[PDB]
C-alpha cells in the first residue's frame, strides 16, 4: 500500500473550516538581492474519519514555528494527540504531520505555523512585480494562486472543493495600500514592533476556494463608484495611469456588467465590493480572484487619445469574462480541474453577453463566431485534438492541471455551451442555470450537476422538445473530440455527418464511444426565410424535405453558426447561394455570409470542395460593407498570401483584391467625410480598419495617397498626430513602405520617446514595413540591443521584419547567423525560440527551402534549440505540407485570380 503523502490527491479524512493568514512582504531586498515574505497561519479543520496523520499542501516554504513545523491544538475541550514529527514531501508538495495517536471524528483542531518564502519575480503564489515610475524602480507584492500556488504562500488544503472562510491580515509599509478579497475591517494600525509598518485586517471571506484568494501591497490609486445597492466599485492602477484617466472606461462598464450578471444569474452579487486592478506585465492576462480581479494593464486600461476601438472591445470583454466568474466558478465551483472547461468555457461564452449589455449598439455577441468557434475548429479538426471531458483520475499533478487551460477548454467550451443555450432557448437555459447556482451556492459541482438542472427546466415545460436528454446530447459534444461536417444534397434532401478533419489523409487513433457520430441541432433558412428546426440523430445518413430544394431555390444551414459544425452542399446549391450574395446579400444573415467563406476554405483544405469553389465564395465581397464576411476572407486568404507573395500568383491576387476592396474603400471615403469621422458602431469601424488595411497592402493608389498624406502631415507637426488610433497600424506601415530614411528615422524617434506600450507596438511593427534592404538590416541590428528594443519585444520585431517579403531572407539569415545566442538567452530570459522559428520559416514552401532548414538543423552538435527544441521539427513538417499544398494548388489558383482580376 502506498503512503498517502505519496499520492497527489489529498485525503478526505480532514476538511478545513476556516483559516487565519497573516502575510508580510519585504519589498526591500536583503543586500544579497533576495526578497522574502514572512507569514503566520492557523487552520481550523474537522476530522471526518479517524487518522494519525495530517497532510496539507506546502510549496517552497521554510518553517520557523517553535518546536515542530506546526503547533497542534484541540478546539474547545477537544484533546489533541502529540506530534511525532513533521516533514516536507517536495514531490507531492505536502507538509506532513505524523501524530502519536489518532484524531477523532467530529472533533475540530487548529494547526498553527510560522513560515517564510521568497517573494520572487515569478508570478506564482505571493510574488513581487517590478516597474518604473520616472527615475524610480517600484516594487509591489501581489498574488497568483491560480490552480495550485496558494500552497506557495501559506500551508493549506489546496484543492478547489475544500472550501473555507479566510481571515487575511497584511503587514506592510505604512505608506502603501493593502487589498484583499474582502474590504478592510477598518483603518490600518501601526505594527508595535516597528511603526514604519502598518497592519491591515480584512473582513472574513465567504466560504471559498484557495485558488481564488488574493492580496496586494502597492502604491496604487483608484477611481471609484458606489452602485445603487451600495456595492463599492473600484479600478486600481499606477498613480500616473489613474491621473491620466486610463481607468475610466473600465469604471464605466463595470456597474452595467455586474447588473447584467446579477439578473442573468438570478442571483445577487455575493460580495460587498468589487476591486479590479491593472498590473504592469501580468503575463497571466487576467485572474478572477473573488472580489479582487487582476488584469494586465493593456487589458484593463484604455487611453482614448492613442487606443483603437479594438482596445475598447478587449477591455469590455475581458472585464465581462472575469466578472462572470464572480458567480459561475467562484460562488459555485467545479470540484476538480478535469472540469475546468465548464468554468472557463462558460465565462468565455457569457463574456459576450455581459459586454453586449455594456455596449448594446456593438453587436458584440457576433464576435464569438470568428473569435472562438472558427478559432478552435482549426485545432479541433486535427487527429491530435482531445475531448472537452477528461476523467478526474487522470488529472493529478500540477503539470496535468495546467494542461487543462487550452484552446479546447476555453473556446470549444464556449462554443458548445452557446450551442446548448441556443437549442434550449436562453430563457430555459437561464432557468436551469439559476436553479444550479441556488442549489450549489458556496459548494462544488461536476458538469453533470449543470446538465441535471438544465434537464429539470426542460422537464418543467412543454414547448421545447429534444430528441434525447440534455446529458445524452451533450455527451456527444464533450466525451469525444472534434466535430462533424454536415453535408446536404439539395436534390434529394439527404443529409449526412462525418468527423471533420482538415487533413483528408490523417489517421484518427483516438477511439470514440460513439463512433464519431453526433446528435446535431440544425437550424436552416430557405430563400431568406427561417424553417422549422431539425435534429440530426446519431446516424451517418438521413433525409428531410427541409433540405430538399427546387432549381430556383436555395437552402442554408446553421443560422448564425450557433451549432458547433461546418456545412457542405452540392455545387448547385453553392452556386445558388453565390447568386443570392451577388444579387441581394441582405437576404442572408451577416454571420452566415462569413460562414460560407470560413466553411468552404476549410472544405477545400479537406478536399471536399475544389479550391475554386471557396474562391468563388469571395466574389460577392465587392458589394459587402459589413465586417465579418470580409474578415472571413482575409483570415482564409492570409495563407495564400504567405504561400504566393513571392510568386507569379501574387500579381493577379493583389489585382483581384484591389478590385474587390475598391468599392468598400470608396464607400468609407464618403461615409467618413474624407476620413474625418469614424463610423458609428464597432462592426463598421472594424470594417473600415480592414478596408484600409486591405486597400493599402494590395497597392490601391487611393489608399497609398491617403497614408502618404497623413504621415507627411504628422511629420510636419509631430506633437499633433493627425492619424486616428484605429488606422495607425496601416497608415504608419504603408507610409514607411513608400518613404525612405526620413519616414523611418522619424518613426524610430517617436518609438524611442513613446510612453504607451500599444503605440510603441504599432511603431515597431510599422518600422518593419520599409522596402529598403539596408534599413531592414540596420533594424535587425537593433533587435538585440536592450537599450533600443526591449528583450521581450526582440523576437516579435524580428518576426515583423520576416513578414516583410523583402525582410524574409534578411530575417532568416539573421536568425541562422545569430542562433549562437541561445547560451545568452535561456537562463536569463526565455526569449521564446519557438515563436521566432515559426515566424521566420512560415513562408517556406519549396524543396530548396526545406533543404536550407535541414541544413540549419545540422548544427545539432550541442547548443540545441532550448525552448524551441523540436519546434524546428514542426517547421520541417509544416514546410513539407506547404510544398505539397503549393504543388497541388498553384496552377488552379493562378488561373482563378487571372480569370477574376478583370
Ligand X SMILES: *[C@@H]1O[C@H](CO)[C@@H](O[C@@H]2O[C@H](CO)[C@@H](O[C@@H]3O[C@H](CO)[C@@H](O)[C@H](O)[C@H]3NC(C)=O)[C@H](O)[C@H]2NC(C)=O)[C@H](O)[C@H]1NC(C)=O
Ligand Y SMILES: *[C@@H]1O[C@H](CO)[C@@H](O[C@@H]2O[C@H](CO)[C@@H](O)[C@H](O)[C@H]2NC(C)=O)[C@H](O)[C@H]1NC(C)=O
Ligand Z SMILES: *[C@@H]1O[C@H](CO)[C@@H](O)[C@H](O)[C@H]1NC(C)=O
Catalytic residues: 322
Q: Is 201 in the site for ligand Y (CB under 6 A)?
A: no
Q: Is 591 in the site for ligand Y (CB under 6 A)?
A: yes
CB environment 498-533: b (16+ within 10 A), e (fewer): ebbbbeeeeeeeeeeeeebbbbbbbbbbbeeeebee
Count CB-CB contacts under 10 A for residue 771: 15
Q: Report, in Å, the least distance between residue 325 CB and Zn ion.
A: 6
Helix axis angle, 701-715 relative to 682-697, nearest 10°?
100
Binding partner of residue 506 among ligand Z, ligand Y, Zn ion, none, CB cut-off 5 to 8 Å per kind: ligand Z
Give the whole-angstrom CA distance, residue 894 versus residue 185: 71
Q: Report, in Å, the least distance between residue 492 CB and ligand Y.
A: 5
Looking at the Cβ atoms of 379 and 587, the one nearer to ligand Z is: 587
Q: Is 740 in the site for ligand X (CB under 6 A)?
A: no
Looking at the Cβ atoms of 305 and 584, the one nearer to ligand X is: 305
User: Alpha helices of 359-409 — where are they, by DSSP H?
Assistant: 368, 374-380, 398-402, 407
C-alpha dihedral over 81, 82, 84, 89, to 10 degrees? 60
Residue ranges that bind ligand Z, judged by CB under 6 A: 505-507, 584, 586-587
Chain residue at closest Cβ approach to Zn ion: 347
Binding partner of residue 444 among ligand Y, ligand X, ligand Z, none, CB cut-off 5 to 8 Å per kind: ligand Y
Q: Report, in Å, the least distance between residue 395 CB and ligand X.
A: 30
Binding partner of residue 587 among ligand X, ligand Z, ligand Y, none, CB cut-off 5 to 8 Å per kind: ligand Z
Instruction: Judge residue 886's burial from the number of C-beta atoms within 10 Å of its C-beta, 0-12 exposed, 13-18 middle, 19 or more buried.
Output: middle
Cell, residue 335: 470540484
The answer to the question of whether 182 is labelled as a binding residue is no
**Residue whose entry in the numeric block shows the C-alpha cell 482575409:** 634
Binding partner of residue 709 among Zn ion, ligand X, ligand Y, none, CB cut-off 5 to 8 Å per kind: none
Q: Is 105 in the site for ligand X (CB under 6 A)?
A: no
Looking at the Cβ atoms of 118 and 662, the one nearer to ligand X is: 118
Q: Report, in Å, the least distance between residue 343 CB and ligand Y.
A: 15
Looking at the Cβ atoms of 299 and 707, the one nearer to ligand X is: 299
The answer to the question of whether 772 is labelled as a binding residue is no
Q: Report, in Å, the least distance between residue 239 CB and ligand X.
A: 18
Q: Report, in Å, the least distance between residue 68 CB and ligand Y.
A: 20
Whole-angstrom CA distances from 50 to 14, 47, 54, 809 are 9, 7, 11, 70
**In contact, 310 and 686? CB cutoff 8 Å:** yes
Looking at the Cβ atoms of 81 and 117, the one nearer to ligand X is: 117
Looking at the Cβ atoms of 384 and 586, the one nearer to ligand Z is: 586
Q: Report, in Å, the least distance between residue 117 CB and ligand X.
A: 5
Looking at the Cβ atoms of 18 and 777, the one nearer to ligand Y is: 18
Instruction: Judge residue 883's burial from the number of C-beta atoms within 10 Å of its C-beta, 0-12 exposed, 13-18 middle, 19 or more buried.
Output: middle
Count CB-CB contacts under 10 A for residue 156: 24
The answer to the question of whether 576 is labelled as a binding residue is no
The answer to the question of whether 321 is labelled as a binding residue is yes
Cell, residue 474: 451533450
- Member of 96, 162, 682, 768 binding ligand Y (CB under 6 A): 162
Looking at the Cβ atoms of 171 and 340, the one nearer to Zn ion is: 340
Looking at the Cβ atoms of 69 and 162, the one nearer to ligand Y is: 162
Give the whole-angstrom CA distance, residue 5 versus residue 481: 35
Binding partner of residue 347 among ligand Z, Zn ion, ligand Y, none, CB cut-off 5 to 8 Å per kind: Zn ion
**In contact, 38 and 126? CB cutoff 8 Å:** no
Site for ligand Y in 172-191 (CB under 6 A): 173, 175
Tell me if residue 411 falls in helix, strand or coil.
Answer: helix
Q: Is 110 in the site for ligand X (CB under 6 A)?
A: yes
User: Alpha helices of 392-510 — where are they, by DSSP H?
Assistant: 398-402, 407, 413-424, 426-440, 447-459, 470-478
Looking at the Cβ atoms of 289 and 478, the one nearer to Zn ion is: 289
- For ligand X, which stretch binds (CB under 6 A), given 172-180, 244-252, 511-519, 715-723? 244-252
Give the whole-angstrom CA distance, residue 472 versus residue 57: 38
Q: Report, in Å, the least distance between residue 44 CB and ligand Y.
A: 5
- Member of 10, 13, 16, 20 binding ligand X (CB under 6 A): 20
Q: Is 699 in the site for ligand Y (CB under 6 A)?
A: no
Q: Is 163 in the site for ligand Y (CB under 6 A)?
A: yes
The DSSP secondary structure of 517-528, one letter per residue, reads ---EEE-EEETT
Binding partner of residue 102 among ligand Z, ligand X, ligand Y, none, CB cut-off 5 to 8 Å per kind: none
Count CB-CB contacts under 10 A for residue 642: 15
* No. of helices (H) and no. of strands (E), the chain: 29, 31
**In contact, 783 and 820? CB cutoff 8 Å:** no
Q: Is 758 in the site for ligand X (CB under 6 A)?
A: no
Interface pattern 338-357 for ligand Y (x via CB under 6 A): --------------------
Give the whole-angstrom CA distance, residue 62 versus residue 225: 42
- For ligand X, which stretch binds (CB under 6 A), given 138-146, 245-253, 474-482, 794-802? 245-253
Whole-angstrom CA distances from 181 to 139, 228, 252, 347 are 21, 21, 22, 20
Residue ranges that bind Zn ion, judged by CB under 5 A: 344, 347
Give the whole-angstrom CA distance, residue 378 versus residue 114: 50
Q: Report, in Å, the least distance between residue 608 CB and ligand Z.
A: 17
DSSP strands (E only) in 541-679: 541-543, 555-557, 566-569
Q: Is 489 in the site for ligand Y (CB under 6 A)?
A: yes
- For ligand X, which stretch binds (CB under 6 A), given 5-13, 248-256, 494-502, 887-895? 248-256
Whole-angstrom CA distances from 803 to 707, 808, 809 are 20, 6, 10
Q: Is 647 in the site for ligand Y (CB under 6 A)?
A: no
Whole-angstrom CA distances from 768 to 184, 764, 774 are 50, 7, 12
* Strand partners for 71: 112
Cell, residue 881: 505540407
- Member of 117, 280, 329, 521 binding ligand X (CB under 6 A): 117
Site for ligand X in 294-323 (CB under 6 A): 302, 304
Binding-residue total with ligand X (CB under 6 A): 15
Q: Is 248 in the site for ligand X (CB under 6 A)?
A: yes
The answer to the question of whether 460 is labelled as a binding residue is no
Q: Report, in Å, the least distance between residue 282 CB and Zn ion.
A: 14
In Å, how far from its chain's centre is CA 814? 31
Q: Report, in Å, the least distance between residue 36 CB and ligand X.
A: 4
* Strand partners for 164: 208
Helix (H) or strand (E) holding 274: strand 273-279
Closest listed residue to residue 670, CA positions, set 701, 702, 646, 694: 702
Give the whole-angstrom CA distance, residue 180 versus residue 61: 21
- Member of 167, 289, 580, 879 binding ligand Y (CB under 6 A): 167
The answer to the question of whether 286 is labelled as a binding residue is yes
Binding-residue total with ligand Y (CB under 6 A): 37
Give the whole-angstrom CA distance, residue 544 versus residue 731: 52
Interface pattern 525-554 for ligand Y (x via CB under 6 A): -----x------------x-----------
Q: Is 362 in the site for ligand X (CB under 6 A)?
A: no
Binding site for ligand X (CB under 6 A): 20, 36, 42, 44, 62, 110, 116-118, 167, 248-249, 252, 302, 304
Which residues participate in the annotated binding site for substrate? 285-289
Binding site for ligand Y (CB under 6 A): 15, 18-20, 28, 42, 44, 136, 161-163, 165, 167, 173, 175, 204, 219, 266-268, 335, 363, 366, 440, 443-445, 489, 492, 494, 530, 543, 559-560, 589-591
Which residues participate in the annotated binding site? 285-289, 321, 325, 344
Amino acid at each position: 500500500q502506498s503512503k498517502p503523502w505519496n499520492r497527489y490527491r489529498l485525503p478526505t479524512t480532514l476538511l478545513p473550516d476556516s483559516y487565519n493568514v497573516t502575510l508580510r512582504p519585504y519589498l526591500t531586498p536583503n543586500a544579497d538581492g533576495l526578497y522574502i515574505f514572512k507569514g503566520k497561519s492557523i487552520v481550523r479543520f474537522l476530522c471526518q474519519e479517524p487518522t494519525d496523520v495530517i497532510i496539507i499542501h506546502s510549496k517552497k516554504l521554510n518553517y520557523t514555528t517553535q518546536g515542530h513545523m506546526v503547533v497542534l491544538r484541540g478546539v474547545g475541550d477537544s484533546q489533541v494527540p502529540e506530534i511525532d514529527r513533521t516533514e516536507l514531501v517536495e514531490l507531492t508538495e505536502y507538509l506532513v504531520v505524523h501524530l502519536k495517536g489518532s484524531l477523532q471524528p467530529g472533533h475540530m483542531y487548529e494547526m498553527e505555523s510560522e513560515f517564510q518564502g521568497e517573494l520572487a519575480d515569478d508570478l506564482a503564489g505571493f510574488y513581487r512585480s517590478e516597474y518604473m515610475e520616472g527615475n524610480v524602480k517600484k516594487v509591489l507584492a501581489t498574488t497568483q494562486m491560480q490552480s495550485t500556488d496558494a500552497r506557495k504562500s501559506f500551508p493549506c488544503f489546496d484543492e478547489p472543493a475544500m472550501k473555507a472562510t479566510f481571515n487575511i491580515t497584511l503587514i506592510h509599509p505604512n505608506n502603501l495600500t493593502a487589498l484583499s478579497n474582502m474590504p478592510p475591517k477598518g483603518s490600518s494600525t501601526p505594527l508595535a514592533e516597528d511603526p514604519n509598518w502598518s497592519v491591515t485586517e480584512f473582513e472574513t471571506t465567504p466560504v471559498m476556494s484557495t485558488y481564488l484568494l488574493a492580496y496586494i501591497v502597492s502604491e496604487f490609486q483608484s477611481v471609484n463608484e458606489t452602485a445603487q445597492n451600495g456595492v463599492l466599485i473600484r479600478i486600481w492602477a499606477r498613480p500616473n495611469a489613474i491621473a491620466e484617466g486610463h481607468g475610466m472606461y473600465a469604471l464605466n462598464v463595470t456597474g452595467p456588467i455586474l447588473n447584467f450578471f446579477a439578473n442573468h444569474y438570478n442571483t445577487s452579487y455575493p460580495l460587498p465590493k468589487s476591486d479590479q486592478i491593472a498590473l504592469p506585465d501580468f503575463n497571466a492576462g487576467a485572474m478572477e480572484n473573488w472580489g479582487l480581479v487582476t488584469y494586465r494593464e493593456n487589458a484593463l486600461l484604455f487611453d482614448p487619445q492613442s487606443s483603437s476601438i479594438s482596445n475598447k472591445e478587449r477591455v469590455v470583454t475581458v472585464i465581462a469574462h472575469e466578472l462572470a466568474h464572480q458567480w459561475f466558478g467562484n460562488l459555485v465551483t467545479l470540484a476538480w480541474w478535469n472540469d475546468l472547461w465548464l468554468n472557463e468555457g462558460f465565462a468565455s461564452y457569457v463574456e459576450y453577453l455581459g459586454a453586449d449589455h455594456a455596449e448594446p449598439t456593438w453587436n458584440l455577441k457576433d464576435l464569438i463566431v470568428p473569435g472562438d468557434v472558427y478559432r478552435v475548429m482549426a485545432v479541433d479538426a486535427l487527429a491530435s485534438s482531445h475531448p472537452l471531458t477528461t476523467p478526474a483520475e487522470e488529472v493529478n499533478t500540477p503539470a496535468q492541471i495546467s494542461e487543462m487551460f487550452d484552446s479546447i477548454s476555453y473556446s470549444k467550451g464556449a462554443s458548445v455551451i452557446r450551442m446548448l443555450s441556443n437549442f434550449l432557448t436562453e430563457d430555459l437555459f437561464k432557468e436551469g442555470l439559476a436553479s444550479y447556482l441556488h442549489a450549489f451556492a458556496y459548494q462544488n459541482t461536476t458538469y453533470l450537476d449543470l446538465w441535471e438542472h438544465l434537464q429539470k427546466a426542460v422537464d418543467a415545460q412543454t414547448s421545447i422538445r429534444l430528441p434525447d436528454t440534455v446529458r445524452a446530447i451533450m455527451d456527444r459534444w464533450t466525451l469525444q473530440m472534434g466535430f462533424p461536417v454536415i453535408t446536404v444534397d439539395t436534390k434529394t434532401g439527404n443529409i449526412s455527418q462525418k468527423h471533420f478533419l482538415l487533413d483528408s489523409e490523417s489517421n484518427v487513433t483516438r477511439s470514440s464511444a460513439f463512433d464519431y457520430l453526433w446528435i446535431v441541432p440544425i437550424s436552416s433558412i430557405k430563400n431568406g426565410v427561417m424553417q422549422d428546426h431539425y435534429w440530426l440523430r446519431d446516424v451517418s445518413q438521413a433525409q428531410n424535405d427541409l433540405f430538399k430544394t427546387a432549381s430556383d431555390d436555395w437552402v442554408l444551414l446553421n443560422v448564425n453558426v450557433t451549432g458547433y459544425f461546418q456545412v457542405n452542399y452540392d455545387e448547385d446549391n453553392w452556386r445558388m447561394i453565390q447568386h443570392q450574395l451577388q444579387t441581394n446579400l441582405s437576404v442572408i444573415p451577416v454571420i452566415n455570409r462569413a460562414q460560407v467563406i470560413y466553411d468552404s476554405f476549410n472544405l477545400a483544405t479537406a478536399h471536399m470542395v475544389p479550391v475554386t469553389l471557396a474562391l468563388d465564395n469571395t466574389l460577392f465581397l465587392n458589394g459587402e460593407k459589413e465586417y465579418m464576411p470580409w474578415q472571413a476572407a482575409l483570415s482564409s486568404l492570409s495563407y495564400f498570401s504567405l504561400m504566393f507573395d513571392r510568386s507569379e500568383v501574387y500579381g493577379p491576387m493583389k489585382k483581384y483584391l484591389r478590385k474587390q476592396v475598391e468599392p468598400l474603400f470608396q464607400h468609407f471615403e464618403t461615409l467618413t467625410k474624407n476620413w474625418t469621422e469614424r463610423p458609428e458602431n464597432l462592426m463598421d469601424q472594424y470594417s473600415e480598419i480592414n478596408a484600409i488595411s486591405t486597400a493599402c497592402s494590395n497597392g490601391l493608389p487611393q489608399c497609398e495617397n491617403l497614408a502618404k498624406t497623413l504621415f507627411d502631415q504628422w511629420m510636419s507637426d509631430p506633437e499633433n498626430n493627425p492619424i486616428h488610433p484605429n488606422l495607425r497600424s496601416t497608415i504608419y506601415c504603408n507610409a514607411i513602405a513608400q518613404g525612405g530614411q526620413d519616414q523611418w528615422d522619424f518613426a524610430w524617434g517617436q518609438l524611442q520617446q513613446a510612453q504607451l506600450v500599444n503605440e510603441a507596438d504599432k511603431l515597431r511593427s510599422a518600422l518593419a514595413c520599409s522596402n529598403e534592404v539596408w534599413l531592414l538590416n540596420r533594424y535587425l541590428g537593433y533587435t538585440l540591443n536592450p537599450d533600443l528594443i526591449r528583450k521581450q519585444d526582440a523576437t516579435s520585431t524580428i518576426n515583423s521584419i520576416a513578414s516583410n517579403v523583402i525582410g524574409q531572407p534578411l530575417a532568416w539569415d539573421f536568425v541562422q547567423s545569430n542562433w549562437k545566442k541561445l547560451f545568452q538567452d535561456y537562463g536569463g530570459g526565455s526569449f521564446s525560440f519557438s515563436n521566432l522559428i515559426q515566424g521566420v520559416t512560415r513562408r517556406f514552401s519549396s524543396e530548396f527551402e526545406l533543404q536550407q532548414l535541414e541544413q540549419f538543423k545540422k548544427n545539432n552538435m550541442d547548443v540545441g534549440f532550448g525552448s524551441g527544441t523540436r519546434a524546428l521539427e514542426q517547421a520541417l513538417e509544416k514546410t513539407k505540407a506547404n510544398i505539397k499544398w503549393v504543388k497541388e494548388n498553384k496552377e488552379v489558383v493562378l488561373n482563378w485570380f487571372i480569370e477574376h482580376s478583370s
